[PDB]
Amino acid sequence: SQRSKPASENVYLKLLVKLYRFLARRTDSRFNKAILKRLFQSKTNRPPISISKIAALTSRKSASSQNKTTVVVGTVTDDERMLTVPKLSIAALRFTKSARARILKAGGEVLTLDQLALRAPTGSNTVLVRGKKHA
Amino acid sequence: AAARPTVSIYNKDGSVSSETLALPFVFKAPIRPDLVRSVHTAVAKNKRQPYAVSEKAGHQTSAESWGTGRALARIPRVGGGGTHRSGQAAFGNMCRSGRMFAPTKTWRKWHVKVNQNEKRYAIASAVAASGVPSLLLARGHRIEEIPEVPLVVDDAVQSFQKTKEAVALLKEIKAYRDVIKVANSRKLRAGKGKLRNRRHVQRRGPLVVFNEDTGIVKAFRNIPGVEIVNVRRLNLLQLAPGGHLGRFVIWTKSAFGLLDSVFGSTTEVAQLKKNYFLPENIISNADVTRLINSDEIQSIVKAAGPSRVKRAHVQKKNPLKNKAVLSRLNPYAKAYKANVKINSEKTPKAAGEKFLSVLHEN
Amino acid sequence: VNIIKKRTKPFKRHQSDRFKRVGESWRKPRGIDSCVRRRFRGTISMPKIGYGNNKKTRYCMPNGLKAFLVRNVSDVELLLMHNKTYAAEIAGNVSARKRVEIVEKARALGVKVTNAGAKVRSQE
Amino acid sequence: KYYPAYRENVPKKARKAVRPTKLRASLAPGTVCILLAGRFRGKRVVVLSQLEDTLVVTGPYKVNGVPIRRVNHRYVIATSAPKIDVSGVSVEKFTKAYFAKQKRSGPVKKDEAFFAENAPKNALPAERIADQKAVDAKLLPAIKAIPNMKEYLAASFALSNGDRPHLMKF
Amino acid sequence: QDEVIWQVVGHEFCSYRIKGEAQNFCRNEYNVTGLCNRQSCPLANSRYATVREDNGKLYLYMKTIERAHFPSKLWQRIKLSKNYAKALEQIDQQLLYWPGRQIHRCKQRLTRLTQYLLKARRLALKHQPALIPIKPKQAHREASRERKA
RNA sequence: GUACGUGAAAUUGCUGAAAGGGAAGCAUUGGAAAUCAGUCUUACCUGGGUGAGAUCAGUAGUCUCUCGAGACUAUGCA
RNA sequence: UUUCAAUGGCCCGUCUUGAAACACGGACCAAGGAGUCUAGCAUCUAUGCGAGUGUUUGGGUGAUGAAAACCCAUCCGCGAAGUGGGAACGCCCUUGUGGCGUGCACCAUCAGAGCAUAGCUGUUGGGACCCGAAAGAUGGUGAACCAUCUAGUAGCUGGUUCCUGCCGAAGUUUCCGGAUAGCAGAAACUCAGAUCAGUUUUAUGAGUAUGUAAAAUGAGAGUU
RNA sequence: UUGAGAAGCUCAGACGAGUAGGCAGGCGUGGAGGUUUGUGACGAAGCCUUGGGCGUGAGCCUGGGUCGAACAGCCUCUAGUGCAGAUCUUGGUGGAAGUAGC
RNA sequence: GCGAAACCACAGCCUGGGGAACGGGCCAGGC
RNA sequence: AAAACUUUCAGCAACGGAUCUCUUGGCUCUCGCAUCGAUGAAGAACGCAGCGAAAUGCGAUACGUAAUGUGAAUUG
């Protein structure tokens, strides 16, 4: 369920695996190889990452997030506890309806994994992130 | 992500009108054959009548075990006499007139639940599939002469009263090729199904979707194959028959204008469904060929290796027998001089008397 | 290109010739103390994947063609481009009214028919 | 009808060039050799010339009646009998086409011989006999010069009891 | 569109597919090869060209992505000359800057459709015995009545 | 043909062929006998003659789409 | 296909047993004939939405079957309640080499992930894979007989139905019917610049061997 | 060079016992939705056959005979779905046997 | 003349050896 | 060694009733309704059908009478 193809029957997920299969072997990037591997992963192994974690991780310590795209192979949920949302650019498999509205109205943009492949085909200036699996 | 902006509305005489309708956002929803056929599988089970055997079948008789060691199987045999039942076994699956193993019960789960949001997703994805002519053809519809897909007709169709009025419209928009297909396909069903009020089978014709009824249902219901439905209660059993996407659907102008309120948009809530938004897609543009073969991506890929590669070394050749392979492996065999004369005319016998004495001992 | 068959004899069920109640169709011997399962000397052979035939020549008739079941004229027209690889085989339930029209159509298409002379006579 | 309708996998370029056949050392022209197979099995004949693969061989017509014929070099035993003078007879006319079977042709129209079967017959032309009459003219004096040669070629070779082909020398 | 259409039709269900053991075939009339592939699917290929025969004349059929939602006007048709050399050039001119695989498959179909028409004309000239069906009821009737006779 | 649609297997009778020193028995390889699939030259290339006709006209019309693309009609067959 | 010749070929299943010996079951053929349905629980996968989630007790509605589909008022259930190594990235610049930063998940050192449905698997109840053990009790009929509870009770007996392919034991340490472990797989992790071995050495010691420490040879290894 | 069912095509090397058990892909049966503009009185299904073919196999296709009204391939759904055994159940039928015997 | 039933994997010469009985099947000998 | 007898194969004839096809039957679910008896019920018996195999119908007015409806049958 994780090795050579996703167990998912979603046709559009198969189209993303097809796109990053090409990017993984025709480029010498470990980002395309890492993204392709995480597309085979199951829902349990792709935890959601909150909109607050993205804001915290980008503006952490020295911050200076500049405009690097935050990439997660998973769902970007919303954190209603945080009140001010920074200007963020996140590419994810799925955004919730509240998270997408909060990101857009509070400055920045939301992307899909195929919109980012056209902006950063080698994944340059990308902040690859993950959700905590402790659950 | 780029689709046709508007659709044309056709009149009763099959002629185009100057009016047009913006394409509703439901036709831009993701098309999910996995999700449509999973929801269809559950919904198709929701009108099943229970069946079960009698609660006493195979146990109506009276029998007892004659015993163990009496040169016969220890299954109980019916008592009494005068009838051939004497000695015949029951209360068991193998025995004739016995209890069949695990008798069927009426409280088997006949119906199955689906989340209401998955159901709305499937119906949205099945409506989107009905705007793709290729999906209509692959599902068995004879739409090769239909003027346009989606096929929208005037609202005057909603007040047809006679079937011959409906047949004239289907012939004017070339939609009768599908009805003729359904009429020709009517066969007697195979199997025991025709002993059980399932006498005949046939194909599915166009699905006519109206807004308000003024005779459209009565004028279309007798045409073999055509199903008439209201835009407010669209049915996945009728939008993906058999779980297959791409039903040929004919809309009236009023039904097509009410699709935006029934389904809403991916950002704006549906008017007729409280707190419902159209599903979003994992990919914005679903043409993977366009992304892969794009200038953005093809400019940074390394030079592609060949396609199916040539077979180097199909057969192993021995250099010690094939002189040509030896010449390739060793660029020195051409000048070797294997036999070189060393001892020409000297050959001095080198064995002193001390060595000879030791050798010639005992 | 010649078709090579690793085996031509079928694999019969063990002890199928001693009993009428036991059919010839191959059944794997589940007995542990069975000599056929342990593959002694003189015991019959069993279906193994080693007997599998060449992929290129698999499903090929001895004449080099692959059978294609045909129920009407529309089926035989599909073999317009594949007449050197496939042979038309009219189904057993197709009537003689349609068998003649399939054979005449398959003649112009240059398609071999495996059972073209069935349920019909000739009249020169 | 000409653009290839199928995949038409062209054969890969083979590397099998045709080089001349190397005949045996003892299969020289003018050698008296025994035919091993055919309708003239056992007959002793005289080798005129070596073709590309076969031997253009003939027994004298008046001696054993073996016309100018091709014989495969594997189907011949080359005896060590004294050689015959063959440099005096031209053998350029003995080519592959000279012995080649006449092309099966004839635009026979429907019926008559096509149906009624009034077929024609074959016959050796006098041209073949004319060339043949020359070779025995240039060969008979050669075989008559040495003793027993005329009687040798007339006889037919055979194996008697207690004859071991591997041991006894030809 | 095309990659979504192919996933739905090429892998879930197409009414045109004949599932054979060695290969899948296509019942579509607009398929050049007659096989079920990604490249030869007329439904999943928005730009598609094929050659088919109408009453003895071969035509080049072409469709573009921009006519995909007008089924009556989807396919355009031109006449291919009886001269083979001119017919090949007609496909080359009409299919200019199309992929070389699509022109290759259209010229291959033109050769097979030309041979079939040639073979159809030669069969008409020849005298071939007419195949007459064997009627199971009449055979049984005549066999029984013969025994009585 | 009311021993009644279809009419399997076990089993029985007759007929034919073959085999047969106290088993059959199956497998592997062939022989013999019987019996089958199992097929063919018929087309290509190049003419020339003769006439034929359109997708050819130093041609005229109509219809459906959209100039030119298909369907036909009349005339010529250079 | 039949038959002949040469060579080979102990009757199948069950139980037993290292193995067999066994003892069982098998006159023959046809048809029937055994892990089912359902409630709960847990893992895993898929799907929907996501700090939420679940329409179907019910109401609204559904003219072409109206037991379907479609819609949702109020509740309620379940959830919410600094330093190192490191994925990935940018910048170099002797450029590879490395260095300089930013450092997810997770592990070492001092910024909620659920809920619902479906399937798989395991498990516990119901008759619970099928056939199997004297009954007992209630009520009747003339100690006996009959009907029902009953599908009563089974650790035990016999049986348990298609094919192919790939993995593949153990048959026992240890505590003590067991909890471990071992053996065999699955998943997630970190690593080939790292470790490992029914290995052989070297030498230190200790008493021809011994253990330990550090050269050859082979294999990418360690985990949870 | 056309060889993109990217679920395809292609190249290379190694390897092949197997009980309990683990895993994967397939064959077949009854019924259901879809489909094949499917097959059928010019003969459906079934059965018979020393006819032919396909598959490693489960099985499948087909000729001939018999027969007389229905039936199948593909995608999906579903289950009372596959037998040589249970001193299995029901039915039929044998050797013992024209025997014991009456 | 009328007429069963038990039983029924299949069989049916010995001699030895064949370790587990092995003789009724296996191996070497006779028939 | 041929016959007989035995065995094997095939043909035909028996035996048997499988399979296939269906079917005025069962089973299950849902919906509407409320109607036995001293004014003799349920049940049992005995009779009547020109004959009815039974079975059904009926009660000495006996496979029914009166009345109404359809309008020409009954039937082996």
Task: Give chain B residues 227-246 with Cβ within 7 A of strand H.
Answer: 241-244
CA-CA distance, E120 to C45, in Å (whole number)?
A: 51
Is the separation of the CB atoms in C83 and C63 below 8 Å? no
Q: Do strands B227-230 and B207-210 pair parallel, antiparallel, or not at all (unpaired)?
A: parallel
- Whether chain B lies against chain C with 3 or more Cβ pairs closer than 8 A is no
Q: How many angstroms separate the Cα of D115 from the Cα of each of B69, D104, D107, D120, D122?
A: 88, 18, 14, 13, 19
Distance from CA of A29 to the nearest CA of E (A): 26
| Distance, CA of B251 to CA of D109 (rounded, Å) | 71
| Biggest CA-to-CA distance, chain D | 71
Per the structure block, which two tokens stand in for D33?
């050799």
Confirm if B31 and E4 have CB atoms less than 8 A apart. Answer: yes
- CA–CA separation, B280 vs A75, rounded Å? 12
- Residue E128 has which token pair? 């071939």
Tell me whether strands B151-153 and B6-10 are parallel, antiparallel or unpaired. parallel
Q: How many CB pairs under 8 A join A and E?
A: 6
Order the strands of the D44-50 sheet from edge to edge: D69-72, D54-58, D44-50, D32-35, D76-78
**Distance of alpha carbon E133 from alpha carbon E128, whole angstroms:** 16
B117/chain A closest Cα distance in angstroms: 14
The two three-digit tokens of residue D89, written as one number: 């007879």
Give the residue carrying structure tokens 């022209």: D29
DSSP per position, D57-80: EE--TTTT---SEEEEGGGEEE--
Reference D154, options D27, D42, D37, D26; nearest CA is D42
CA dihedral over E11, E12, E16, E17, signed as positive or negative: positive
Q: Do A and C have ≥3 inter-chain CB pairs under 8 A? A: no
Query: How many other CB atoms are there within 10 angstroms of residue B61's CB atom?
Result: 16
At E120, is the secondary structure helix, strand, or coil? helix
The token pair at B41 is: 């599988």
Please, what is the Cα angle at D7 between D2 and D12, to 5 degrees? 100
**β-strand B227-230 against B200-201: which pairing, if any?**
unpaired
A38 φψ region: left (φ > 0), alpha (ψ -120 to 50), beta (else): alpha
Alpha carbon distance D150, D142 (integer Å)? 10
What residues have CB less than 8 Å from A74, skipping those under 6 apart? A46, A47, A48, A49, A92, A93, A94, A130, A131
**Do the beta carbons of residue C88 and residue C94 sit within 8 Å?**
no
Residue type, A28: D
Helix ranges (H only) for C4-45 are: 35-38
The reply to whether A50 has its C-beta less than 7 Å from any atom of strand G is yes
Alpha carbons C19 and C36: distance in angstroms, whole number: 17
Place of tokens 């047809």: B160
**Angstrom distance (rounded) from CA B280 to CA B30:** 7
The answer to whether residues E112 and E33 touch, using CB atoms and an 8 Å cutoff, is: no
Neighbours of D165 (CB within 10 A): 8
How many domains are contained in chain A?
A: 1
3-state secondary structure chain B: CCCCCEEEEECCCCCEEEEEEECCHHHHCCCCHHHHHHHHHHHCCCCCCCCCCCCCCCCCCCEECCCCCCCCCCCCEECCCCCCCCCCECCCCCCCCCCCCCCCCCCCCCCCCCCHHHHHHHHHHHHHHCCCHHHHHHCCCCCCCCCCCCEEECHHHHHCCCHHHHHHHHHHCCCHHHHHHHHHCCEECCCHHHHCCCCEECCCCCEEEECCCCCHHHHHCCCCCCEEEEHHHCCHHHHCHHHCCCCCEEEEHHHHHCHHHHHCCCCCCCCCCCCCCCCCCCCCCCCHHHHHCCHHHHCCCCCCCCCCCCCCCCCCCCCCCCHHHHHHHCCCCCCCCCCCCCCCCCCCCCCCHHHHHHHCCC
Task: Say how far apart CA D138 and CA D134 lie, in whole Å.
Answer: 6
Residue C17: nearest nucleotide (C-alpha to C1'): F26
Cβ E82 to strand F below 7 Å? yes
Element (H, E) at E34: none
What subunits touch chain C, counting only 3 or more CB pairs under 8 A? D, E
Evaluate the omega torsion of the peptide bond into residue B5 and state whether it is cis, within 30 degrees of 0. Answer: no
What's the token pair of residue D131? 């060339």
- Half-sphere CA count of C35, side-chain side, radius 13 A: 6
Q: Which residue has the tokens 């506890």?
A: A81
**Which of residues 13-32 of C have CB within 7 Å of strand H?**
14-15, 19, 21-23, 25-27, 31-32
Domain containing A122: what range?
1-135
Coil, strand or helix at D115: coil
Distance CA A40, CA A3 (A): 7
Secondary structure (DSSP) of C68-111: EEESSHHHHHGGGS-TTTEEEEE-TTS-HHHHHHHHHHHHHTT-
Residue with tokens 């195949």, as numbered in its chain: E131
| C28/D contact by beta carbon, under 8 A | no
CA A72 to C1' G200 (Å) is 53
Distances (CA, A) of B15 to B220, E66, E72: 20, 21, 13
Task: Using the structure block, give the residue that is written with the tokens 């780029």.
Answer: B2
B52 touches strand J (CB under 7 A): yes
CB B138 within 8 A of CB E15: yes
Q: What is the DSSP code (8-state) at residue E59?
A: E
Which pairing describes strands B207-210 and E24-26: parallel, antiparallel, or unpaired?
unpaired
Q: Taking a C-beta distance cutoff of 8 angstroms, is the pair A21, B293 a contact?
A: no
For chain E, the distance separating the N- and C-terminal CA atoms, rounded to the nearest angstrom, is: 73
Measured distance CA(C6)–CA(B228) in Å, rounded: 60
Helices A51-58/A97-105 angle, 10° precision: 40
Distance in Å from H66's C1' to E138's CA comes to 15
Does residue E121 approach strand F to less than 7 Å at its CB? no
The H or E element that residue E5 is part of is helix E2-11
Set out the domains of chain E in order of their start, with CATH numbers. Answer: 1-125 (3.30.390.110)
Q: Measured between alpha carbons, how far is D98 from D124 in angstroms, rounded to an integer?
A: 13
Q: Mapping DSSP to helix (H, G, I), strand (E, B) and coil, where does residue C49 land?
A: helix
Choose among C68, C14, B225, B115: nearest CA to C77.
C68
Cβ atoms of A85 and A103 closer than 8 Å: yes
Q: Quote the tokens at residue D98.
A: 């000279």
* 3 state SS of D48: strand
Count CA atoms within 13 Å of residue B258 on its CB side: 17
What is the spatial distance between Cα D33 and Cα B164, in angstroms, rounded to a whole number? 101
Residues from chain B that touch E16, judged by Cβ atoms under 8 A, are 138
What whole-number distance in Å separates Cα of residue B214 and Cα of residue A18? 50
Cα B231 to its chain centre, rounded Å, is: 26
Contact E27 C78 (CB under 8 A): yes
Question: How many angstroms away from the CA of E1 is the closest CA of chain C?
Answer: 27
Query: D66: alpha, beta or left, given left = phi > 0 and alpha = psi -120 to 50?
Result: beta
Q: By the 8 A CB rule, do A6 and A39 touch? A: yes
Alpha carbon distance E31, C77 (integer Å): 12
Residue spans per domain, chain D: 1-170
Residues for chain B: how many in total? 362
CB atoms within 10 A of CB B353: 7
Which residues on chain C are in Cβ contact (under 8 Å) with D6?
81, 84
CA distances (Å), B235 to each of B19, B209, B231, in order? 28, 11, 9
Query: ∠E83-E86-E90 over CA atoms, to 5°?
Result: 130
Q: For residue E21, what is the DSSP state?
A: S
Residues of B in contact with A14 (CB under 8 A): none
Show the CA angle centred on residue B241, arms to residues B238 and B243, nearest 5°.
125
Distance between CA atoms of residues A63 and B56, nearest Å: 77
- Rounded Cα distance, A80 and A99, in Å: 9
**CB–CB of E52/E77 below 8 Å?**
no
Strand partners, D34: D44, D77
Q: Rounded to an integer, what distance in angstroms lies between the CA atom of residue B130 and that of residue B144?
A: 15
- What's the Å distance between residue A71 CA and nucleotide G98 C1'? 29
List the nucleotides on chain F closer than 7 A to a protein CB. 9-10, 24-29, 38, 41, 43-45, 55, 65-66, 69-72
**Residue B166 is encoded by which pair of tokens?**
């409906």
From B131, B146, B287, residue closest to E3, measured CB to CB: B287
Nearest to E105 by CA among E23, E56, E57, E38: E38
Strand C66-70 versus strand E24-26 pairing type: unpaired
Please, are residues E88 and D4 in contact by the beta-carbon 8 Å criterion?
no
Give a three-class secondary structure readout of chain A. Answer: CCCCCCCCCCHHHHHHHHHHHHHHHHCCCHHHHHHHHHHCCCCCCCCCEEHHHHHHHHCCCCCCCCCCEEEEEEEEECCCCCCCCCCCEEEEEEECHHHHHHHHHCCCEEECHHHHHHHCCCCCCEEECCCCCCC
3-state secondary structure at position E143: helix
Q: Using the beta-carbon criterion (under 8 Å), do A122 and B302 form an inter-chain contact?
A: no
Count Cα neighbours of A72 within 13 Å in the Cβ-side half-sphere: 25
Pull the structure tokens for residue D130. 């004319």
Q: Tell me the C-alpha to C-alpha distance, in Å, between residue C29 and each of B158, C7, C32, C37, C41.
A: 69, 21, 8, 6, 16
Contact E31, E9 (CB under 8 A): no
Residue B258 CA to residue B246 CA, distance in Å, equals 20
Helix or strand run (H / E) with residue D56: strand D54-58
Give the resolution value in Å.
3.0
CB of E76 lies under 7 Å from some atom of strand F: yes
Q: Whole-number Å distance, CA E59 to C1' F74?
A: 26
Q: Is D169 exposed, middle or buried (0-12, 13-18, 19+ CB in 10 A)?
A: exposed
Nearest Cα residue to B37 out of B114, B137, B150 = B114
Q: Which two tokens stand for residue B343?
A: 């001892």
Tokens of C47: 């279906």
Bridge partners of residue A45, in order along the sequence = none
- Which of E13, E15, E71 is opposite residue B143, by nearest beta carbon? E71
b (16+ CB within 10 A) / e for E12-51: bbbebbbebeebebbbbebbbbbbbeeebbbbbbbebbbb
Sign of CA dihedral B277, B278, B279, B281: negative
Q: Which nucleotide in the DNA or RNA is closest to residue A75, CA to C1'?
A: G50
Q: Under a CB-based contact definition with an 8 Å cutoff, are residues A10 and B279 in contact?
A: no
Rg (CA), chain B: 41
Q: Is the dihedral of CA C73, C74, C76, C81 positive or negative?
A: positive
Distance C95 CA to H32 C1' (A): 30
Ramachandran assignment for C7, one of left (phi > 0), alpha (psi -120 to 50 degrees), beta (any other) = beta
Instruction: Quickly count: other Cβ atoms within 10 Å of residue B325's Cβ.
Output: 14
Task: Give how far Cα A128 sits from Cα of A37, A52, A73, A74, B152, Å.
Answer: 13, 15, 9, 11, 47
Give chain A's length: 135
Question: Assign residue B102 a region: left if phi > 0, alpha if psi is -120 to 50, beta otherwise?
Answer: left
d(CA E142, CA E137): 9
Measured CA to CA in angstroms, residue C42 lies from C7, C12, C19, C35, E97 at distances of 18, 15, 20, 9, 68
Residue E74 near residue E45, CB atoms below 8 Å: no
What's the rounded Cα separation, in Å, for the pair B276 and B119?
12
